[PDB]
UniProtKB/Swiss-Prot annotation:
Enzyme Commission designation: 3.4.21.64
GO biological process entries: proteolysis
Binding positions (Ca(2+) 2): 16, 260
One GO CC term on file: extracellular region
Name of the protein: Proteinase K
Residue span relative to the full protein: 106 to 384 of 384
Provenance organism: Parengyodontium album (Tritirachium album)
Swiss-Prot/TrEMBL catalytic activity: Hydrolysis of keratin, and of other proteins with subtilisin-like specificity. Hydrolyzes peptide amides
Cofactors named for this entry: Ca(2+)
Family the entry assigns: Belongs to the peptidase S8 family.
Gene assigned in the entry: PROK
Lineage: Eukaryota, Fungi, Dikarya, Ascomycota, Pezizomycotina
Keyword Calcium: yes
């Protein structure tokens, strides 16, 4: 399948070169998979989600996304126009308030929630969790991400936006999950992207168009935007049967575009997420 005039990041993940604008992908499109977006919520009524998104949990007075961040990330996972895996099921877990903040205790509870809640959902092709969040190093936060992964969920986490080594941030620094840095449309490391040996992969993260609250759209930047590209890619590849939740990060690294990014610090992987789809 071909989506013309796609957001640059979608075109990038199906291309061996920057500078194109058509996204190519297998029509299975993540059908039968599920992606949890652990964030500020999801505006599930947005036409772009086509009834495939729902809120399943909140720790606050509402499950609605009063911020936009979670809706944007969910759109990059799975919206019809802005999403990688256009037929996946999206489940929102609101661990962040409408200012975008959350206590680590709530974030940990949300991860353990997903590890159990997947047993209440129909995801025959597999389960992914996208975590566009983080703060300073916490062994308890890392352990929660490790449990979620161990339970059979492909966990993708943002590297962080500090232009620093991600070893000092959580859950970015957890070795067993997929830690995602950000790149721009010219294949440069995004100016804010964290780096370091704990990164597994880069995805598009600068000037990413996606859904927003109020039935709208906007372009924003962050490792928060790169993470759902990888989460949606994992769901798409799991639906194709090419990998599993336990092996998808490694598979994405195996099949990535290699050595194509600029300003990658010595010791950080030079790997850009790629779907290897041959039309």
């Amino acid at each position: 399948a071909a989506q013309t005039n796609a957001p640059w990041g979608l075109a990038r993940i199906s291309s061996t070169s920057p500078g194109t604008s058509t996204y190519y992908y297998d029509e299975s499109a993540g059908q039968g998979s599920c992606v949890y977006v652990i964030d500020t919520g999801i505006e599930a009524s947005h036409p772009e989600f086509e009834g495939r998104a729902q809120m399943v949990k909140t720790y606050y007075y509402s499950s609605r996304d009063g911020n936009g961040h979670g809706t944007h990330c969910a759109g990059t996972v799975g919206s019809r126009t802005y999403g990688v895996a256009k037929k996946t099921q999206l489940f929102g877990v609101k661990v962040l308030d409408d200012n975008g903040s959350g206590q680590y205790s709530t974030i940990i509870a949300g991860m353990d929630f997903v590890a159990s809640d997947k047993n209440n959902r129909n995801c025959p092709k597999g389960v992914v969790a996208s975590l566009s969040l983080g703060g300073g190093y916490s062994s308890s936060v890392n352990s929660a991400a490790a449990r979620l992964q161990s339970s059979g969920v492909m966990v993708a986490v943002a590297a962080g936006n500090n232009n620093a080594d991600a070893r000092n941030y959580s859950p970015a620094s957890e070795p067993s999950v997929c830690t995602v840095g950000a790149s721009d449309r010219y294949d440069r490391r995004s100016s804010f992207s964290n780096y370091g040996s704990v990164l597994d992969i880069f995805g598009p993260g600068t000037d990413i168009l996606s859904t927003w609250i109020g039935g709208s759209t906007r372009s924003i930047s962050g490792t928060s935007m790169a993470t759902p590209h990888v989460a949606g890619l994992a769901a798409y590849l799991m639906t194709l049967g090419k990998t599993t939740a336990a092996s998808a990060c490694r598979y994405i690294a195996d099949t990535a575009n290699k050595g194509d990014l600029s300003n990658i610090p010595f010791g950080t992987v030079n790997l850009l997420a790629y779907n290897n789809y041959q039309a």
